[PDB]
Amino acid sequence: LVRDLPQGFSALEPLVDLPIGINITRFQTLLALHNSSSGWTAGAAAYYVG
Amino acid sequence: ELLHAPATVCGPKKSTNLVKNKCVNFNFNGLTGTGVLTESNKKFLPFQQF
């Protein structure tokens, strides 16, 4: 239990190769809950981007 | 053709056997050199090669 990111250390292991030759300029992500009663809507959660 | 993108098409690799406890040359996925290969008592992480 914590209200924020943990006071510790962890190293990140590699997942993919993907030799993709694309010139990337920007970024956009998304996932939310959408019911069928009141039409398209949104959930209530946040994610971190650094 | 080949201009900028990383190779996506190549031919077969004519590999051979492996000789231990002898002075031999070697080539591990392009990593060339010489010496004697012996059983190690140490471990690599699952994704580490050299």
Swiss-Prot record, chain B:
User: Per the record, which residues fall in region Disordered?
Assistant: 4-26
Organism annotation = Severe acute respiratory syndrome coronavirus 2 (2019-nCoV)
Outcome when changing H4P: Increased resistance to human covalescent sera neutralization
Annotated function: Attaches the virion to the cell membrane by interacting with host receptor, initiating the infection. The major receptor is host ACE2. When S2/S2' has been cleaved, binding to the receptor triggers direct fusion at the cell membrane. When S2/S2' has not been cleaved, binding to the receptor results in internalization of the virus by endocytosis using host TFRC and GRM2 and leading to fusion of the virion membrane with the host endosomal membrane. Alternatively, may use NRP1/NRP2 and integrin as entry receptors.
State the covered range within the intact protein.
516 to 565 of 1273
Summarize subunit and interaction data from the UniProt record for this chain: Binds to host ACE2. RBD also interacts with the N-linked glycan on 'Asn-90' of ACE2. Cleavage of S generates a polybasic C-terminal sequence on S1 that binds to host Neuropilin-1 (NRP1) and Neuropilin-2 (NRP2) receptors. Interacts with host integrin alpha-5/beta-1 (ITGA5:ITGB1) and with ACE2 in complex with integrin alpha-5/beta-1 (ITGA5:ITGB1). May interact via cytoplasmic c-terminus with M protein. May interact (via N-terminus) with host bilirubin and biliverdin, thereby preventing antibody binding to the SARS-CoV-2 spike NTD via an allosteric mechanism.
- The domain of life is Viruses
What gene makes this protein? S
* Full protein name: Spike protein S1
